Amino acid sequence: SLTMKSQLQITVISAKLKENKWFGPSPYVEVTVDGQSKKTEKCNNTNSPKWKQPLTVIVTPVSKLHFRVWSHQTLKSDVLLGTAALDIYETLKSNNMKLEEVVVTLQLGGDKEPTETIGDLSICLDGLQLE
Ligand SMILES: [Cl-]
């Protein structure tokens, strides 16, 4: 029951990234959960990326979703801009135990400094219920 899986759709909607003082980042989002990793495509040179991109992951009612916002680079590692996490069980609680097009915004915490908010990330969850 807490072990039954669902192929959850997560639409990664958009993010607002605090400006860094010339050209902006070229961000995409990676979702990781339960052995899996799914990445959106990138937006180029923007602190207000709008992906509106649906991804799926196979989760249980107690899975914990982890988000990373990366900036793409050709010639070295992509840069980790910030991270967030969302407990699917808490999300279910907040929405009568059924995730039907639930929009959630999360604060993104900095890589080098976890305590610093570097932006926020909006997603929409659909296709999971408990009971
Ligand atoms: Cl949470």
CATH number at residue 23: 2.60.40.150
Ligand 1 centre and the CA of 71: distance in Å?
24
Ligand 1 centre and the CA of 74: distance in Å?
33
Phi and psi torsions of 42, nearest 5°: -90, 160
Q: How was this structure determined?
A: X-ray
Ligand 1 centre and the CA of 103: distance in Å?
13
Ligand 1 centre and the CA of 76: distance in Å?
32
Q: Breaks in the chain at C–N > 2.5 Å: after which residues? A: 21
Ligand 1 centre and the CA of 85: distance in Å?
6
Contacts of 72 (CB under 8 A, 6+ apart): 26, 27, 28, 42, 78
Let me know: does 57 contact 34? Beta carbons within 8 Å.
yes
Domain limits at 83? Answer: 1-131
Q: How many domains, the chain? A: 1
* Dihedral angle of Cα 88, 1, 98, 123, to the nearest 10 degrees: 30
**Burial (CB count <10 Å: 0-12, 13-18, 19+), residue 71:** middle
